[PDB]
């Protein structure tokens, strides 16, 4: 009946349109290590969500699951003033990044002693049932993340923890694959540690451009996500007309009861700022949060998408994949 | 004449006994993800370093370099509380970790931007010269460190920003070398960006037994330092019978003026409380601040090391590195 945001229990009933990507802080880790240079100004950077939020909030949207992994700057009470200053329901996560990009040393050690997937496992209860740090605020999905091509040793370790914890929470399970891959192996090792293929959202399938690879992933029955909209020419991503082109020939197979869309947007970076060079800035220029409703659902509506349709990605899903 | 500590400028002359290689915080990567079991507990932690400082200053140190890098956890406001609480002279470092065990993500994107060494060099500047974060603290030294078997890409970036930032501020560069390795190959690469050999200090160098490899490295002008002294069994380290064995080759070839001797010590671990396994606990068990003083020393003079020797090194050589 009830989910976790970061202002506490709301009836699912009531998320209505839903984003299940979106990230209003983030960070790549060793930002912190940047701090003289690079500062959290909270005002400006509450200013600037707090504008990410309106614009969302201008195309219908009351919801955004926002899965920033732990070791990227993630900041619940932050996110909680969003929140509060602009009636959106913000969901927040609990879990680490991908090793290629995250900050496994601290995990890593921990192995040695033995103890590392029974501490992440605490870490996921303590943060789903209890609170994170001393905010109060409790995670409502377990994010997880997977390396081109593989699923680590060292990311196995959550992903056997995330198993673990859903079971004795019924928590959703919000993934990153890298790249386009591993997206049918994180399904099936999830589902081979007890995990409810409804309570799961393989994310950046639209990093694939193979229909066949997703009809793989859909096969779990867990749900899938084209949440990267916008980002082209980087992290390896394909065009939004890609995307578009994969995402129809599901749509049009019937597969929209597991689909979400998102952006991944980063509305405020951590650290020092920066600004894109040439080449990739005109490629990027449509990854912000109104993308998918200026650009994205009129190019759907105009390949024959009915309302019906959006309607489920976008609310029925989550609804679903919450309850 | 001066070097700046967490307190401000102080005399080099005044400086005295030094241990040049100590940490009274440190954390792996990734301790910020565990925040909820791991929060920092300042005031258990300020009389554990306090304590860590007065059985220093019982064996008559009186100025600690603490080279914390900044993605490691580095807190110079925490470490002016324990000079200001005991008298210690501080010195603390600006800098990242190696590739293998940092937190590399957040430079290495900034290497896409093509700002990536400008900026750390930038940051060097700023925290030599005009403050770390808020606190006003100087740092004294600068921090590089590389990885086993290799001068990585990323971290030939800091070697670069670190002769540069040298050149214009004579700032003491002290270095990490993973697994007795590469320490040539530091020496080398800083001399050909200009750096000065007299303010420089190779470090790790006891964790490699031969001497042929430190009589490589002295012969650069750079002083080394045996200063992981009680690490045994651990990131590959070799027996303290093995460094001390390594340490008297070279203190009877005449080497003493180049050399320096510390432990190493982490006095409070950020992040998760933890305790050794068995195996690695009992290897470990004189990894403590006392450890030269008690058993090294000891050991170095019934092995006819004279007083002069000792008091060059941890006098006479701190004195000369930052004057
Ligand atoms: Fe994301
Ligand atoms: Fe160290
Ligand atoms: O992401
Ligand atoms: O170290
Ligand atoms: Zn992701
Ligand atoms: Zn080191």
Redesign the pocket.
Known sequence: EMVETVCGPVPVEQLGKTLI?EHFLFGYPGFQGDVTRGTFREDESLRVAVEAAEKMKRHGIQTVVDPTPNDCGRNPAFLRRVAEETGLNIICATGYCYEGEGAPPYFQFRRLLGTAEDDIYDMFMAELTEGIADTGIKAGVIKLASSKGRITEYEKMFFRAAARAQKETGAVIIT?TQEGTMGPEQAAYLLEHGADPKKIVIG?MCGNTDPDYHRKTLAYGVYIAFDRFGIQGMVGAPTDEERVRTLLALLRDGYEKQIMLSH?TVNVWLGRPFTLPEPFAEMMKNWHVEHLFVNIIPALKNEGIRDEVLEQMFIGNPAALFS
Chains 1, 2 share one sequence.
Do not use: A, D, G, T
Request: hydrophobic share 0%; glycine share 0%; aromatic share 0%.
């Open positions: 990507h990153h950046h991944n």
